[PDB]
Structure formats: structure tokens, C-alpha cells
Design a protein that fits this description.
The structure is cut from a larger assembly and holds chains A, B, C, D and E.
Chain A: E1 4-6, H1 15-23, E2 30-32, E3 46-49, H2 53-63, E4 67-68, E5 71-72, E6 76-77
Antiparallel strand pairs in A: 1-3, 1-6, 2-3, 4-5
Chain B: E1 3-7, H1 15-22, E2 28-32, E3 35-36, E4 41-42, E5 45-50, H2 53-63, E6 67-68, E7 71-72, E8 74-77, E9 83-90, E10 93-102, H3 108-119, E11 131-135, E12 139-142, E13 175-178, E14 186-189, E15 202-208, H4 210-217, E16 225-231
Antiparallel strand pairs in B: 1-5, 1-8, 2-5, 3-4, 6-7, 9-10, 9-16, 10-15, 11-12, 12-14, 13-14, 13-15
Chain C: H1 5-10, H2 15-22, H3 25-38, H4 42-54, H5 57-64, H6 70-82, H7 87-98, H8 101-113, H9 116-127, H10 130-140, H11 144-156, H12 162-172, H13 178-183, H14 189-201, H15 204-213, H16 216-225, H17 230-235
The chains are: A alpha+beta, B alpha+beta, C mainly alpha, D mainly beta, E mainly alpha.
Protein name (chain B): Peptidyl-prolyl cis-trans isomerase E
Catalytic activity (chain B): [protein]-peptidylproline (omega=180) = [protein]-peptidylproline (omega=0)
Keywords (chain B): Isomerase, mRNA processing, mRNA splicing, Nucleus, Phosphoprotein, RNA-binding, Rotamase, Spliceosome
Chain lengths: 78, 232, 236, 99, 104
């Protein structure tokens, strides 16, 4: 479970408000939030690696309460 | 399936007339007649709730297109295991009624909680609350009648109650399941959501008004979705 | 009220004083119903009078029907007093019609004031000169079946005016029973002649007019011809 | 009272010979003329089948044959109360009756 | 629930053979005697069962057992599926492709 997939975001969000955002729950050890080079903008889906698995299963339970730019945030195991 | 719509009511018809005209089919629990306070008269229709769904059914068959006070009336469904309803308003517009069957046979404590929250018989409930989280092809979540954002709600038993069992599975759209530590928050599924099996307690199903649920889903919220009325 | 209930369990003028002191009115109407039931003559009508002193009114009218004639009309006046107008008034008109022709005609008139009443009044005309006026007005109000009904009225009631209304039915639809409508004027050779001229304007009806002035199978194949290779069949 | 009955006939194995269990009955719905591809104000009893073209029937009368609990409340919604309540699909002969 | 069970089954034992209708008048424990009390139903079961034991009070000398279980065996999904399909297609066709002929 150490990693999660996160959908439905707005590009003003970046890797930092994800950092800050999910460490509110529990620390994101490895952050991945693609920067698209071609048009220089984000599609808004994320992958998160944690310290171990327990962090991330609690993360499955609590985790999908985040709302990025008035809008819904997908978090599921991976 | 206990609530009936009754239209084509003459001005002289009131709650007493309705009680007398429908009681021959079975005991009645409630009669609502929307009023226009500027005129003090009703708008030509009402909702009659029977104790038993079977009696409501017999009434529809014998009273639809029958005569009352000289004119023809219209009777139809407005929208052992309890059946409850929610009338939904989207933006400023009525959307219709969702009717739900609660599986008291499988999850009695969970079904009873939701039933009471529909009737308000314990002093609080769903009326006027919102569907605050709506995700297309997934689910429509509501029941947070205290904080309106997914952090609140309360059960008839206290803040929280146990997961009764996970017998009923998330097999398709139109199922009722508890959000969660059960309180009052719940969701209506919009597809098979089997990844939630064993994590959320399923406790009922939509029996009428799947189309109204689809209208809620269409807002997944882009516009406010409100439980304008509810009951048993 | 509980003392009134226990006193009711204990349960005429002094008793009426105890009851009025105990009060509520629905129990009194139930008591009058108890009197009307227990009496089941004139004393019951006196109980109805005391009930009038007490002031469902249609139910009182039903009790008045149980008392059963001008006094009944007075009870109808009480029913008129009960309300300005909805189904209970129709029940009053129903009792008025079931049993003084003016009593029914007036209720039929008030029913005419508000179309089902016009229908019941039409049934009253069907029961019957004035009813014939109501029926002819019902037909002339402005349908071919209804024209057949008015033609039946010509067959019953009452001739030139019938020829005029028949002219109206003819102008309304130049199609084959019209000669029969003309036949009422013969009551016949002339109406049959109208059936013949109508045939020219278009089968057996002219022959029936001839008998009036005085084979059905071939007439039926002819009817097959009268239906609106097919033309060859019309030839055969 | 008085009710309407429609008898819709379909192809005689002429073109349906070219059968891959892809939704291989007709469906009816009451549509308000308020939405069209000028004038409006009446309903239509639309009837549809996959290949063939849609069909409509104007219903000026506010209500006809709108019954009251015909059967004894059995719940297979199919599509809606209208379809199960009052339609028949002779699939063997390809005749759709509606009343 | 052992108490309730025991009293139900005992009053059921005696009721299976006037003693209860006398007990009720002689002595809120037996409140299940009225068809109002839910448990009453299960009562009607037990008694019946005991009534049955009185039937062949005769030995049972029952291949046959197998045959029987087969016959008992002998004594919806697809439909649901088809219905689902119908709902999908009905929801997914143009109700605005009108081409009417007549009217009633």
C-alpha cells in the first residue's frame, strides 16, 4: 500500500501542497506529481511512497477526504 | 412505496377529507398538503403515507381516476423491511423522489438508524441536509446534517456504532452503504463498487427513482443537492 | 373531559345540562344518532328537532330521508343552509331526484349551473315535453351518433322543424341513414323520396321509402358494393 | 373507459439475416413536444427498435387508459411501469402491441 | 435466552397433550401465549413438532434416504441481466428522432 494514486487536481496545486497536504495525514517520503514538459502543465494525478505499509493503509482509510480546488481527490492503493 | 401522490383536489378537500377517503384501504401515518400562504388554500395536490406498502398499492388501483368532490383525481407512488423516501431538489429545482428499502433483516441496527433519520422521530435527521460529495461513476454521499462536509453527523445511538456485518456487497448502482465508526453519513452507489466490500456496511437499495439518483450523479457538487423532504 | 367521559359511561333535560356542562359536539351528534337508531316514529323526528336545536348535515338529511312531503323540502332547505355548494350537495340533489318533480328539476338546474349536472338533467329529460326541450337543446348546443339520438327524439317527441334539424344533420354530414331521418317526417313516401334524392346525391333505403309509400342478402352484397379488382368486385 | 391499441409490424427476415446477441424488445416512451429539432403542446407515444426508425403518436387527450393497479404489484421494472404494464412483444412473429 | 426457551418448550410440552388455559388463570411470564407476543409464533412451531412426535409413537426403517434428498432438491439472474440491458438501451436512444404518422 506504500504508494497511492491521486486523481482530479488543478495545476496551481504542485508537489509542495501535496507534500504539505498528505503529511497532514502522515509523511510522504517519496512524492511524484508529474510535470508535463510539452505544454508545461499538470494533468493532476499523483503517486505517493511512504515509510512502510501501515502509514498507507490508514492512508486508504482517512486519505480520500482531501478536496483540491473545491474539487474531489482520488486516493487508492498501489 | 408507502407514500402516494394525490392530485386534482377540489378546493373543499382538506386533510380530513383525504383521511376519510383513503382510510378504507388501511391505516395512514401522515397526510401533507402544501399550502399557498398568500391565499391560504392548497395547490391542488397532497401526499398520503400509508402504514403498509400493500395498502398503498390497493389504494392506487382503486382511487386513481376516481371521483372526489365532483372531479377526477390522480393517484400514484410519489417516488418487515422498512421503506423510506427522500425528495431531492437540485439547485432551485425539484428533481423527484428516491424510494429505498432498508435491509432490517440483515443489518437491523443500521437500517433502524437510517429509518429514524428519515422520519426525524428521535429529534434530528436528514431533512434539509445535502449530498456534499458526489463522484460520477462512483457514489453520491450525504447525511452530514451537522457539518455538511463529511466531518459530522450522528447516529440515533450516539456519535458512532459498530459495523454490524458485511453480508451485503457493493454489487451495482442504487445501493445504500454507510460512510465511515458509523454515524449518519451514507452513500448511494452509482456503479459496482466492490473495492469497498468489507469496509463499508451495505444496508439497503433504491426501489424507485434510480433516475433521480442519476440526476444527483450528474452534479458530480456543481449545484447544491438537497433532501427537501424525507420520511417512511 | 375525562369526567364527561365517565359521565357518558353513566349515561333527559337535566342529563343534557350535565352533558353541556361536561363540554364535544361530535359526542352529541353521536347521541342524536343513538336516538335515531334506538327509535328505529314522530318522536325520532322530535329528536331531529332537538338536533336542529344543537345547531354531518347531509347525514342529518339522510335521517330526514329515514323520516320519510313539504317537510322534506324544508330539510332540503336546511341542506342548502348547510353550505353554499361539494359531493354532499350532489347527494342532496340525488335524494331530490330519487323522490315533487320541481324538487328534481331545481337540483338538476343547480347541477346545470356547474357539465355532469347537465348530464343528469339530460337523463331526467330522457326519463320524459320540457325534458324534450332539454334534450333538443342538448343536441342543438353544438356527433353523428348524437344526430341519430336527436333523430330518435324526432321519432319519439312530435314536423317541419324536424325536417329543419334533419337539414342541419344533412349539412353536417351528407352520408346512409339520413333517409331514415327524413322518414320521421312521413310519420313516408316523401321522406323515402328524400332518401332517393340523397341516394342520387351519394341503396335499399329508397325501397324502404317505397314501402312507406305503400333479398336482404343481395342487398348485403350491394352493401359490400357500398363499402368506401375491387371495382371489378363492385361490378360483380 | 376507452383506450388506444397499436399494432406495429417488423421485417420478415429480409435484412436481419446479416445476429451477434447484441441487444438482439422494442421500447416505448411518452415525450413532450416541448423539444424538437416551432409549435408544441402535446405528447407523443414514441416507439423505438435498434435498426428501424422511431415512431410517434400524438395524444391530445390528457389521459386515456391510464389505469389503477392493474396487476398485483409485482416488481420487475424492466424499463418502466408503462412498458411492463401495457405492452406485448410477439418476438416470434415480430409484432409489437401497445395498449 | 435459556429461560425463555425453556418455558416456551415446557408450556409447549404440556400444551401438546387445558393445563395452560388453567395455569394462566391460576397464577407476566407466559405472555407469549397471546399471538401478539412475537415468540408466540415459534411456540406454534414447537408444539406442532411435539404434536408430531405423538404421531408415530412406530419405528422408522428408512437408498431411500438418498432418493428422498434428491426429491427434496427437485422440489432469475438471467432475467435481471436482460432487464439491465433494456434499461441501458432505453436510456441510450434518441427520443428526439420523431417521425409520426397519425393521432388518437
Amino acid at each position: 500500500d506504500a504508494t497511492v494514486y491521486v486523481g482530479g487536481l488543478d495545476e496551481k496545486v504542485s508537489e509542495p501542497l501535496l507534500w504539505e497536504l498528505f503529511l497532514q495525514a502522515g509523511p510522504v517520503v517519496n512524492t511524484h506529481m508529474p510535470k508535463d514538459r510539452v505544454t508545461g502543465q499538470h494533468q493532476g494525478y499523483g503517486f505517493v511512497e511512504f515509510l512502510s505499509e501501515e502509514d498507507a493503509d490508514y492512508a486508504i482509510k482517512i486519505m480520500n477526504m482531501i478536496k483540491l480546488y473545491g474539487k474531489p481527490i482520488r486516493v487508492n492503493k498501489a | 412505496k408507502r407514500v402516494l401522490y394525490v392530485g386534482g383536489l377540489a378546493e373543499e378537500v382538506d386533510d380530513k377529507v383525504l383521511h376519510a377517503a383513503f382510510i378504507p384501504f388501511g391505516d395512514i401515518t401522515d397526510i401533507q398538503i402544501p399550502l399557498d400562504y398568500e391565499t391560504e388554500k392548497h395547490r391542488g395536490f397532497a401526499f398520503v403515507e400509508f402504514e403498509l406498502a400493500e395498502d398503498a398499492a390497493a389504494a392506487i388501483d382503486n382511487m386513481n381516476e376516481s371521483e372526489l368532490f365532483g372531479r377526477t383525481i390522480r393517484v400514484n407512488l410519489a417516488k418487515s423491511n422498512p421503506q423510506v423516501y427522500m425528495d431531492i431538489k437540485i439547485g432551485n429545482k425539484p428533481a423527484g423522489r428516491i424510494q429505498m428499502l432498508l435491509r432490517s433483516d440483515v443489518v437491523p441496527m443500521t437500517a433502524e438508524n437510517f429509518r429514524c433519520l428519515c422520519t426525524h422521530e428521535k429529534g434530528f435527521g436528514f431533512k434539509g441536509s445535502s449530498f456534499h460529495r458526489i463522484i460520477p461513476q462512483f457514489m453520491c454521499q450525504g447525511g452530514d446534517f451537522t457539518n455538511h462536509n463529511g466531518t459530522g453527523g450522528k447516529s440515533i445511538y450516539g456519535k458512532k456504532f459498530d459495523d454490524e456485518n458485511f453480508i451485503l456487497k457493493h454489487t451495482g448502482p442504487g445501493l445504500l452503504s454507510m460512510a465511515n465508526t458509523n454515524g449518519s453519513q451514507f452513500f448511494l452507489t452509482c456503479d459496482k463498487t466492490d473495492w469497498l466490500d468489507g469496509k463499508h456496511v451495505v444496508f439497503g437499495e433504491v426501489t424507485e427513482g434510480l433516475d433521480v439518483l442519476r440526476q444527483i450523479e450528474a452534479q458530480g457538487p456543481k449545484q447544491k443537492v438537497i433532501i427537501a423532504d424525507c420520511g417512511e | 373531559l375525562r369526567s364527561h367521559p365517565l359521565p357518558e359511561t353513566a349515561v333527559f333535560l337535566k342529563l343534557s345540562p350535565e352533558s353541556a356542562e361536561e363540554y364535544y359536539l361530535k359526542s352529541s351528534d353521536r347521541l342524536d344518532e343513538a336516538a335515531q337508531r334506538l327509535a328505529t316514529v314522530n318522536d325520532e323526528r322530535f329528536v331531529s328537532k332537538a338536533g336542529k336545536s344543537n345547531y354531518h348535515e347531509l347525514c342529518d338529511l339522510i335521517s330526514q330521508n329515514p323520516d320519510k312531503q313539504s317537510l322534506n323540502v324544508d330539510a332540503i332547505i336546511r341542506g342548502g343552509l348547510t353550505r353554499f355548494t361539494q359531493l354532499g350537495k350532489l347527494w342532496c340533489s340525488l335524494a331530490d331526484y330519487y323522490i315533487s318533480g320541481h324538487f328534481e328539476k331545481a337540483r338538476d338546474v343547480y347541477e346545470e349551473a356547474i357539465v355532469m349536472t347537465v348530464r343528469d338533467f339530460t337523463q331526467v329529460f330522457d326519463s320524459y315535453e320540457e325534458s324534450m326541450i332539454a334534450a333538443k337543446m342538448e343536441t342543438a348546443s353544438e356527433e353523428e351518433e348524437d344526430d341519430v339520438d336527436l333523430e330518435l327524439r324526432l321519432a319519439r317527441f312530435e314536423l317541419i322543424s324536424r325536417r329543419p334539424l334533419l337539414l342541419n344533420s344533412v349539412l353536417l354530414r351528407q352520408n346512409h341513414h339520413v333517409h331514415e331521418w327524413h322518414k320521421r317526417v312521413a310519420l313516408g313516401r316523401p321522406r323515402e323520396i328524400i332518401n332517393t334524392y340523397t341516394e342520387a346525391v351519394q341503396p335499399f333505403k329508397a325501397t324502404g321509402k317505397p314501402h312507406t309509400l305503400w333479398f336482404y342478402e343481395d342487398n348485403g352484397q350491394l352493401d359490400d358494393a357500398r363499402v368506401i379488382a375491387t371495382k371489378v368486385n363492385f361490378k360483380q | 373507459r376507452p383506450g388506444y391499441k397499436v399494432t406495429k409490424q417488423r421485417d420478415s427476415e429480409m435484412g436481419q439475416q446479416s445476429d451477434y446477441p447484441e441487444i438482439a424488445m422494442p421500447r416505448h416512451r411518452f415525450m413532450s413536444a416541448y423539444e424538437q429539432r416551432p409549435d408544441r403542446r402535446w405528447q407523443y407515444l414514441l416507439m423505438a427498435a435498434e435498426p428501424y426508425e422511431t415512431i410517434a403518436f400524438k395524444v391530445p387527450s390528457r389521459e386515456i387508459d391510464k389505469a389503477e393497479g392493474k396487476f398485483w404489484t409485482h416488481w420487475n421494472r424492466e424499463t418502466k411501469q408503462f412498458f411492463l404494464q401495457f405492452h406485448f412483444k410477439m418476438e416470434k412473429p415480430p409484432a409489437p402491441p401497445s395498449l | 435466552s435459556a429461560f425463555d426457551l425453556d418455558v416456551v418448550k415446557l408450556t409447549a410440552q404440556f400444551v401438546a397433550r387445558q393445563f395452560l388455559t388453567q395455569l394462566m388463570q391460576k397464577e407476566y411470564q407466559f405472555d407469549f401465549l397471546r399471538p401478539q407476543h412475537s415468540l408466540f409464533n415459534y411456540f406454534t412451531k414447537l408444539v406442532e413438532q411435539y404434536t408430531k412426535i405423538l404421531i408415530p409413537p412406530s419405528k422408522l426403517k428408512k437408498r431411500e434416504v438418498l432418493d428422498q434428498v434428491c426429491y427434496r432438491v427437485e422440489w432469475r439472474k438471467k432475467e435481471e441481466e436482460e432487464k439491465e440491458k433494456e434499461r441501458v438501451a432505453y436510456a441510450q436512444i434518441d427520443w428526439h428522432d420523431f417521425v409520426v404518422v397519425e393521432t388518437v
